Amino acid sequence: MVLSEGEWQLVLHVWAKVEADVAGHGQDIVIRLFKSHPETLEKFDRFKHLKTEAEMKASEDLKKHGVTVLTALGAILKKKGHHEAELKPLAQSHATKHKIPIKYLEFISEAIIHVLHSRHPGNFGADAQGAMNKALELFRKDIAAKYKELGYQG
Ligand code: HEM
């Protein structure tokens, strides 16, 4: 797939808002993922002991990991599709070391869209959401193709 420049502008316009508070957005997204799809929490040996949302909010570690996740995603979205290099190490660690199924990347995509819709209603109308969804679908498709080449079924 290929996004048009207008779709990338809608994605990077909302992302510039997210970047005003990377840690707050990373925390909301990862918690949203774990609350919605609790099975994803089992993949993190680091955080699986966390039992409640209050414990998740109070974990500095979790907040630090959310920042790492959004910084890496931000770096990929700012390439506007030319992200082949950035994707290689990410696909290798998530397919070989962590073993993350593509279905879980769909679940976090849903969590990113939920949180942006909830924090940025004015910059995340239907067209901007469609463009973000297209950008994350592109990301998932390119990662799934890499998973294949690496020998891991998504
Ligand atoms: C937007 C999609 C995601 C991005 C950009 C992302 C990014 C990262 C980055 C940059 C790291 C540290 C370096 C590395 O190990 O590769 C990492 C580690 C990790 N990721 Fe992801 N990730 C994503 C989705 C997921 C999902 C959906 C899961 C699980 C359901 C997951 C599980 C993990 C685990 C288990 C680690 C190691 C955590 C720790 O022990 O430090 N990732 N991720």
Instruction: Say which CATH number the domain at 152 has.
Output: 1.10.490.10
84 by Cβ neighbours in 10 Å (0-12 / 13-18 / 19+) ranks as exposed
The residue behind tokens 């779709």 is 7
List of residues 6+ apart from 148 with CB closer than 8 A: 154
**Cα–ligand 1 centroid distance for 77 (angstroms):** 16
- Separation in Å, CA 44 to CA 38, 50, 61, 134, 146: 11, 10, 12, 27, 22
Maximum Cα–Cα distance across the chain: 43
Cβ(19)–Cβ(60) below 8 Å: no
Q: Which residue has the tokens 């679908």?
A: 137
CA–centroid distance, 124 to ligand 1, in Å, is: 25
Domain that holds residue 150: 1-154
Nearest to 142 by CA among 85, 71, 96, 98: 85
Among 147, 1, 152, 6, residue whose Cα is nearest residue 87: 147
Q: What is the CA radius of gyration of the chain?
A: 15
Query: Domain count of the chain?
Result: 1
115 within 8 A of 32, measured Cβ to Cβ = yes
Which amino acid belongs to residue 71?
T
**Sign of the C-alpha dihedral, residues 53, 57, 58, 59?**
positive
Cα-to-centroid distance, 70 and ligand 1 (Å): 10
Q: Per the annotation, does 120 bind a ligand? A: no
